[PDB]
Every structure is written in structure tokens, then in C-alpha cells.
């Protein structure tokens, strides 16, 4: 049994990108037609995963898969969200011991690379 994720947005994109550039590299440049996958392993102490992402000039494909410990459950289906307008955020409870797969999918984009500002947290 897997719990449904929580998903929302918040209006301030500028404050987000400003702080992401601040902290680390933490910015994925997604080439034309490329698909980047960020692997976030689950924490024993941790119950929850939190993700935030935004883009500069264009939308990008985003979804979340959970890999067990190779079966794959679909947490967030991959669709095109507009992160250039606002910051997209979400959270999910651990189904168990495994690894989260954060998908950034630029495949549909012929001529345009995508700069992805993202951040990750976990509770406990």
C-alpha cells in the first residue's frame, strides 16, 4: 500500500532561484531531448521526502517514481508543469526501504535546453 503524494505551488520564483544559486551547484542544465533523473535514497530515520523545483524560461516534464529494495511504482506521473511561472513543490511518505527517482524530462524539446533549479529535504 502506497500513500498518495501532496503537491502544491507557491508564487515566489525569484526568491527560490536566488537561494538555490546561493547554496550549491544545484542547477541541472537539461540538454535538448535529454532526460535527467535525480536519485534520492530513503532515510531509515526519515518518514518523508520533500521536493521543490523551478525553471528559468520554459516548462519541463516532471514526475516521481519509487524504486524498491527492479520494481517501480509511479508516485507522480510525468507531465509538463510550468515551473518558469512559479515554484512547484510536493511531498511523499516513504512506502518503505527504497530509492526515489526524480524525473526531469526535456524529451519533447527539440531546440531548447532547460535550466532546472531544484531542492530536496527529508524529515526526522
Amino acid at each position: 500500500v502506497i500513500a498518495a503524494p501532496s503537491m502544491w505551488t507557491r508564487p515566489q520564483i525569484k526568491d527560490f532561484k536566488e537561494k538555490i544559486q546561493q547554496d550549491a551547484d544545484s542547477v541541472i542544465t537539461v540538454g535538448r531531448g535529454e532526460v535527467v533523473t535525480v536519485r534520492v535514497p530513503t532515510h531509515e530515520e526519515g518518514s518523508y521526502l520533500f521536493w521543490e523545483f523551478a525553471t528559468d524560461n520554459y516548462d519541463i516534464g516532471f514526475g516521481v517514481y519509487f524504486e524498491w529494495t527492479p520494481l517501480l511504482d509511479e508516485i507522480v506521473p510525468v507531465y509538463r508543469r510550468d515551473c518558469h511561472e512559479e515554484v512547484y513543490a510536493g511531498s511523499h511518505q516513504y512506502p518503505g526501504r527504497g530509492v526515489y527517482l526524480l524525473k526531469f524530462d526535456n524529451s519533447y524539446s527539440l531546440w531548447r535546453s532547460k535550466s532546472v533549479y531544484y531542492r530536496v529535504y527529508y524529515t526526522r
Binding site: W8, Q12, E34, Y48, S91, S107, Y122
Partner: protein, 40 residues
């Protein structure tokens, strides 16, 4: 501070200020991903 309470907090009210407060309170721990896969 229960995890589901932290989630409802960030979901209901969300800003860099709240993100930093939760961080400072240890309610959320920043995490660097282990690997980044690329492909076409």
C-alpha cells in the same frame, strides 16, 4: 513536531522564510542527491 504536521505546514503556508525556519528547527534536513543520471 510530527512529520505529517511539518508537511501540512509547508503545504498550507510556503515561503523561503518558512523553509528556513523548519530547517533551523531541524524539522527538515537538506539532502544532496547521490547520483544524477542523464540520457536521450
Amino acid at each position: 513536531p510530527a512529520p505529517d504536521a511539518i508537511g501540512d505546514l509547508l503545504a498550507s503556508v510556503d515561503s523561503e522564510e518558512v523553509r528556513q525556519y523548519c530547517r533551523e528547527q531541524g524539522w527538515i534536513i537538506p539532502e544532496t542527491p547521490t547520483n544524477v543520471e542523464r540520457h536521450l
